[PDB]
mmCIF file of C-alpha atoms in Angstrom:
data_model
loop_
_atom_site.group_PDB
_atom_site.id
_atom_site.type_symbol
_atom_site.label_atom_id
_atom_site.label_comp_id
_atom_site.label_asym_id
_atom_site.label_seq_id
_atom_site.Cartn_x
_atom_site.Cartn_y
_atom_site.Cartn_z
ATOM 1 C CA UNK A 1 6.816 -11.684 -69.564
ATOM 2 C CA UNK A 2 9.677 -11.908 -71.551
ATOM 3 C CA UNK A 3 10.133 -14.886 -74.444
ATOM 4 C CA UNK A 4 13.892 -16.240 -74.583
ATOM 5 C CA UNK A 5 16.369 -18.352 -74.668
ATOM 6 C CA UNK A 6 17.926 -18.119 -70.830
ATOM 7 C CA UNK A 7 20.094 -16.227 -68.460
ATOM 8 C CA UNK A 8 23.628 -17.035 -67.821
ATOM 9 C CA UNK A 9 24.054 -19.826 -65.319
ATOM 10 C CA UNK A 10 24.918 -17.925 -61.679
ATOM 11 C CA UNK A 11 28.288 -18.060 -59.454
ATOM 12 C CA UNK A 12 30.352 -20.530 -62.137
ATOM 13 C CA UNK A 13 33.606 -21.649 -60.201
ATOM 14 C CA UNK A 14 35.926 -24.344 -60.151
ATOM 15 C CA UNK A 15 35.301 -26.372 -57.261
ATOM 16 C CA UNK A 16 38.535 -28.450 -57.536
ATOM 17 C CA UNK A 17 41.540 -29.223 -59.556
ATOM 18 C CA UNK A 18 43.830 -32.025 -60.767
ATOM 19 C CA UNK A 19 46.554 -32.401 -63.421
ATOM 20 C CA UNK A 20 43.755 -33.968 -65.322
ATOM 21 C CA UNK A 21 40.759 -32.463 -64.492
ATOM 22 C CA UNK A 22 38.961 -29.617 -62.834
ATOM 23 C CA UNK A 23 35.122 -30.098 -61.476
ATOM 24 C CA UNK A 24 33.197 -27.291 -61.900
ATOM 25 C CA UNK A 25 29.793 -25.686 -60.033
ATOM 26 C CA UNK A 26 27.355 -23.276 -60.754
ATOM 27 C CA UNK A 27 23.733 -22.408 -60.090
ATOM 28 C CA UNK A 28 20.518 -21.878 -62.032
ATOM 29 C CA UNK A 29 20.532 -18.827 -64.306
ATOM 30 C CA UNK A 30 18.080 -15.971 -62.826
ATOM 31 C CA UNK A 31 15.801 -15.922 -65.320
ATOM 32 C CA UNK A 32 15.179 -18.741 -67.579
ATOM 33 C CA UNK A 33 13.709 -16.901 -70.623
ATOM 34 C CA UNK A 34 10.088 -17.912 -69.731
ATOM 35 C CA UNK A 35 10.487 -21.477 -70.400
ATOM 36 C CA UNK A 36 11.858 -24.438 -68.247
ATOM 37 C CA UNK A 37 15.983 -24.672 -68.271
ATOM 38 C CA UNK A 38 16.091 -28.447 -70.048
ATOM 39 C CA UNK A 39 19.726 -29.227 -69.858
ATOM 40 C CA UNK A 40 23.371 -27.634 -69.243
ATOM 41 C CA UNK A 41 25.794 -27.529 -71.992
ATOM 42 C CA UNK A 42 29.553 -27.939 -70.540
ATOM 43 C CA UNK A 43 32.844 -26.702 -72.696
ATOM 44 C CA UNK A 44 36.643 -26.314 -72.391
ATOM 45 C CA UNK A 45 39.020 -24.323 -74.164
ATOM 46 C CA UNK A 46 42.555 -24.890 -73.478
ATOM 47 C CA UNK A 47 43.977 -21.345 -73.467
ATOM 48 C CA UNK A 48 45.783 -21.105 -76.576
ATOM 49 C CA UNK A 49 42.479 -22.814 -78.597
ATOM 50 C CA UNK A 50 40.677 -19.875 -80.136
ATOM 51 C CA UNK A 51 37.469 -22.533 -80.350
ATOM 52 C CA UNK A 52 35.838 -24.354 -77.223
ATOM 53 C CA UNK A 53 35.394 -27.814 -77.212
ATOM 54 C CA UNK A 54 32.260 -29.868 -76.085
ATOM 55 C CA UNK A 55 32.415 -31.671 -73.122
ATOM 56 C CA UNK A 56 28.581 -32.440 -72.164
ATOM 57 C CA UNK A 57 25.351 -31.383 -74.205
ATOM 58 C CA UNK A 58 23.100 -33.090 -71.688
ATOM 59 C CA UNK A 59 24.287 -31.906 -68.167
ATOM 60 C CA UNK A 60 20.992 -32.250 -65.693
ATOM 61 C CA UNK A 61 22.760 -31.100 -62.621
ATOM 62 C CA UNK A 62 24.728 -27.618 -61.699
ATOM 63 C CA UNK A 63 28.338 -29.204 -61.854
ATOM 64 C CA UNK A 64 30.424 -31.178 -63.743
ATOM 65 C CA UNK A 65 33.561 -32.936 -63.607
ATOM 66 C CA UNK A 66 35.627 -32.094 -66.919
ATOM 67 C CA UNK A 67 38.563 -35.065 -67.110
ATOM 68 C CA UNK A 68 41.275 -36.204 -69.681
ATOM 69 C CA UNK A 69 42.749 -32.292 -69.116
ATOM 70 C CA UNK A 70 46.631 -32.097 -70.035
ATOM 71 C CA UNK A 71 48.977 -31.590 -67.614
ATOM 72 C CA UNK A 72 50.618 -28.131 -67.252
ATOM 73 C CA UNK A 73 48.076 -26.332 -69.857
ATOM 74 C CA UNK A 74 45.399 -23.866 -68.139
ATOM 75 C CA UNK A 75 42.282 -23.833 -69.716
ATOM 76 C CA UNK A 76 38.585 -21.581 -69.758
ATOM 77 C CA UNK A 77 35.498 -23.522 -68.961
ATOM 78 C CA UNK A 78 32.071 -22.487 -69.872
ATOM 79 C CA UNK A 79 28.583 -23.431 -68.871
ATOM 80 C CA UNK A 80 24.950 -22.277 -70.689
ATOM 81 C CA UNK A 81 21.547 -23.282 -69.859
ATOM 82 C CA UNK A 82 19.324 -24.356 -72.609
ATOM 83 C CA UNK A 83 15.351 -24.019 -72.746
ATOM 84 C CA UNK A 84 13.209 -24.848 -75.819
ATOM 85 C CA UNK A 85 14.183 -21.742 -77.675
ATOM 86 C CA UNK A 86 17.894 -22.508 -77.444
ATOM 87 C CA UNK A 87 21.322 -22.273 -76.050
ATOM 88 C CA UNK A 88 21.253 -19.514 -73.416
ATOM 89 C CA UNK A 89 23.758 -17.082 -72.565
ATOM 90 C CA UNK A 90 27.255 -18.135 -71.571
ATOM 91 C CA UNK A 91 29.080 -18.094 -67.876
ATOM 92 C CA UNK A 92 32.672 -18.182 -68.195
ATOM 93 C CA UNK A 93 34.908 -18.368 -65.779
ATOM 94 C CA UNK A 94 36.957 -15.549 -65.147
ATOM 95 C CA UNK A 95 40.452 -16.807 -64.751
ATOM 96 C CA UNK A 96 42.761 -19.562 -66.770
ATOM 97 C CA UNK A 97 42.898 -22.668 -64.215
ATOM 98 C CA UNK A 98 46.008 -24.712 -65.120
ATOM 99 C CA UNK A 99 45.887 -28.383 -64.771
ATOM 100 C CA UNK A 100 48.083 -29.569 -62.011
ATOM 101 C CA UNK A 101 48.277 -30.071 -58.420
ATOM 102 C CA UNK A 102 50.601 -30.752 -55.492
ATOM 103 C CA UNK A 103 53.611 -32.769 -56.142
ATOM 104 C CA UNK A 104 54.948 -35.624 -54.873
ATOM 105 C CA UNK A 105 57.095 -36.282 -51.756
ATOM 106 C CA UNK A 106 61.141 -36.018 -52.323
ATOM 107 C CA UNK A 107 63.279 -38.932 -52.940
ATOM 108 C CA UNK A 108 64.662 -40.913 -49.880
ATOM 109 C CA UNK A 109 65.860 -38.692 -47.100
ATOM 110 C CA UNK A 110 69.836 -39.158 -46.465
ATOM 111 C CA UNK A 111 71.602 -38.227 -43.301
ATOM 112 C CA UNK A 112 74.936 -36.752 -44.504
ATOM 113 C CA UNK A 113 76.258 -35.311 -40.915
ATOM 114 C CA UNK A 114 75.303 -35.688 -37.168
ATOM 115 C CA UNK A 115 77.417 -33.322 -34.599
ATOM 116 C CA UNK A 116 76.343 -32.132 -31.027
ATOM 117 C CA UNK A 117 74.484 -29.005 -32.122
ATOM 118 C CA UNK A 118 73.522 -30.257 -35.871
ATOM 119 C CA UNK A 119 72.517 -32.553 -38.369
ATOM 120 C CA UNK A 120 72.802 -32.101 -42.253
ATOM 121 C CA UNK A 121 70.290 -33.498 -44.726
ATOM 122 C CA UNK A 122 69.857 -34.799 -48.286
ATOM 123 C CA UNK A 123 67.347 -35.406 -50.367
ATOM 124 C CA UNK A 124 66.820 -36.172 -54.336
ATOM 125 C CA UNK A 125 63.853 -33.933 -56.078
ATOM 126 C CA UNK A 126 59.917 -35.529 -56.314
ATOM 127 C CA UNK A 127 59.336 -38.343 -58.965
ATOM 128 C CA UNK A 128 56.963 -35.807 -60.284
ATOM 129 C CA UNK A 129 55.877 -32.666 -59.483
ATOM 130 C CA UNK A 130 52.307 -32.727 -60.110
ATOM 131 C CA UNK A 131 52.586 -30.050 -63.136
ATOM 132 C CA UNK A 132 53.924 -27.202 -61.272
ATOM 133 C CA UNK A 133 57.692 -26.743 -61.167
ATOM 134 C CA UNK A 134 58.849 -27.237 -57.683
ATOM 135 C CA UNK A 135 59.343 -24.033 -55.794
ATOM 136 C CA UNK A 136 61.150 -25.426 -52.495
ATOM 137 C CA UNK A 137 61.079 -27.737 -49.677
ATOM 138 C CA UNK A 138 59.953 -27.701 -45.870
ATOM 139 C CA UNK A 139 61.931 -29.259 -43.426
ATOM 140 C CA UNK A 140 60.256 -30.099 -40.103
ATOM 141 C CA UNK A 141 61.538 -31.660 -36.688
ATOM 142 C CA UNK A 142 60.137 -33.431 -33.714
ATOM 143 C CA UNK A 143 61.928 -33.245 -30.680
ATOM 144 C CA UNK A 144 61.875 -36.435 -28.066
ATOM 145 C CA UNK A 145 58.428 -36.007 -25.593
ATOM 146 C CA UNK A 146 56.938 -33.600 -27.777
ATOM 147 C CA UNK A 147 53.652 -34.240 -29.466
ATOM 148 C CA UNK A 148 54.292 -31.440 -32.086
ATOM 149 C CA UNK A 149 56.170 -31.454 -35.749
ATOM 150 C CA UNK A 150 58.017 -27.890 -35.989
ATOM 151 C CA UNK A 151 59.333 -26.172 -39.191
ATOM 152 C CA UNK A 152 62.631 -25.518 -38.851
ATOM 153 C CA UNK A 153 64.045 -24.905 -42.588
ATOM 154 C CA UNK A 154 62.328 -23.468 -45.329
ATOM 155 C CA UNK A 155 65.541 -24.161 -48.718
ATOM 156 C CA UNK A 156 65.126 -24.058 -52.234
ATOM 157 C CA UNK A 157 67.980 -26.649 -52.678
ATOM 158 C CA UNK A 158 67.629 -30.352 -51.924
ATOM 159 C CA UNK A 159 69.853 -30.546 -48.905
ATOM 160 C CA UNK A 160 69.296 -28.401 -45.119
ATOM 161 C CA UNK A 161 71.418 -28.379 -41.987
ATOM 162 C CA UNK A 162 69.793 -28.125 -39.019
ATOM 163 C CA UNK A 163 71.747 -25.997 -35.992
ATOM 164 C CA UNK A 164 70.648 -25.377 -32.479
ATOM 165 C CA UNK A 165 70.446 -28.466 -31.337
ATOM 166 C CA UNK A 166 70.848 -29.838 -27.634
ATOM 167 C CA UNK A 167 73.361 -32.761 -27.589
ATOM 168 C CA UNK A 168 72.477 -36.080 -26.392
ATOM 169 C CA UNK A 169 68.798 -35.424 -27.294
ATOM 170 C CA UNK A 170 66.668 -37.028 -30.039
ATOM 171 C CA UNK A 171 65.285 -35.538 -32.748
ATOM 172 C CA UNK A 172 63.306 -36.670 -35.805
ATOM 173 C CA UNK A 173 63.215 -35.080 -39.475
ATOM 174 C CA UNK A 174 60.473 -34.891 -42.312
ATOM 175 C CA UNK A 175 60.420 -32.918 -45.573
ATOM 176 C CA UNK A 176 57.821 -31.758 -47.919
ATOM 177 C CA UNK A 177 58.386 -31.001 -51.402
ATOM 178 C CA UNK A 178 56.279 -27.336 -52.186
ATOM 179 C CA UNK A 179 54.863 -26.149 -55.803
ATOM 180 C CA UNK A 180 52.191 -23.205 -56.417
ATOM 181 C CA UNK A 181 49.435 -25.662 -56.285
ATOM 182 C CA UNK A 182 50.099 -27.330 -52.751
ATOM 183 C CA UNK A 183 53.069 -28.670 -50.622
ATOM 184 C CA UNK A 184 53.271 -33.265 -50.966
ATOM 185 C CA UNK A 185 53.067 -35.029 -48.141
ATOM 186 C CA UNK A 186 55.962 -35.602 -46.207
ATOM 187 C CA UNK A 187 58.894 -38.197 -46.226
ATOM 188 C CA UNK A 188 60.206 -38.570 -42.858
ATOM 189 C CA UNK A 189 63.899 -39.508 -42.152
ATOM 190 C CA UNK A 190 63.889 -43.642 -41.547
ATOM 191 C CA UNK A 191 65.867 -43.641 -38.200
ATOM 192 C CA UNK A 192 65.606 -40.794 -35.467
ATOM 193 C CA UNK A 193 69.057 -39.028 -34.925
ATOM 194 C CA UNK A 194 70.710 -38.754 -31.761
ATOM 195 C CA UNK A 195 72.826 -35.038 -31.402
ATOM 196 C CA UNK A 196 76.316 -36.170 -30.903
ATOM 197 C CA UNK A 197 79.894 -35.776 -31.438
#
């Protein structure tokens, strides 16, 4: 049948993503050009490059882990098969991916009131925010016997009060620090807080 160089590798994604690195997957081009697919040749282009950049001319499986990305720039990656007659056509992947991921936890949670029906919270911003400017925090509670944590404020400023609360019972407090990418694992509040006063 046909004589060429091959088809474009199949179904090219990103598979995962750091603020250093993304791995990608694909699968075998369709049609190989009528001669065996020898390697996969791997490339980058951070989005304001107009040129691609090499990242593996001998790539013998369908994914790859491209690393030493910088943080907060988005980048094109591109994957084509080779046979003996040459590079193949190119899979690209449809959309920028930016380099970043979910941020840290906030600072130190600080209890700044207690009353009978509230308590009033305090936090300082994430060491770091994993490349993606942080778009708000989620405040969740756990109320004494319950074997359930509950959102119960959703701020985009470092501080919450919490109202509604039953007084002389227990409660304990958590935040998360949110970003496009993913929300940080929580810091919980050192000491539970009685309602009182």
């Amino acid at each position: 049948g046909a004589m060429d160089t091959p088809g474009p590798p199949q179904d090219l994604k990103v598979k995962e993503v750091t603020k250093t690195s993304v791995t990608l997957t694909w699968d075998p081009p369709l049609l190989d050009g009528g001669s065996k697919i020898k390697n996969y040749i791997v490339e980058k282009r951070e989005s304001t490059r107009k040129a691609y950049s090499t990242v593996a001319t001998n790539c013998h499986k369908t994914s790859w882990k491209v690393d030493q990305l910088q943080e907060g720039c988005s980048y094109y990656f591109r994957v084509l098969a080779e046979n003996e007659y040459g590079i193949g056509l190119p899979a690209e992947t449809a959309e920028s991916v930016k380099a970043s991921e979910r941020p840290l936890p906030p600072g130190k949670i600080t209890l700044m009131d207690v009353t009978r029906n509230s308590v009033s919270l305090s936090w300082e911003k994430p060491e770091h925010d994993g490349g993606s400017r942080i778009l708000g925090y989620i405040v969740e509670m756990q109320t004494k016997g319950s074997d359930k944590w509950a959102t119960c404020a959703t701020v985009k400023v470092t501080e919450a009060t919490i109202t509604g609360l039953i007084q002389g019972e227990e409660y304990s407090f958590r935040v998360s620090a949110q970003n496009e990418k993913g929300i940080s694992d929580p810091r919980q509040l050192s000491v539970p807080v009685i309602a009182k006063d």
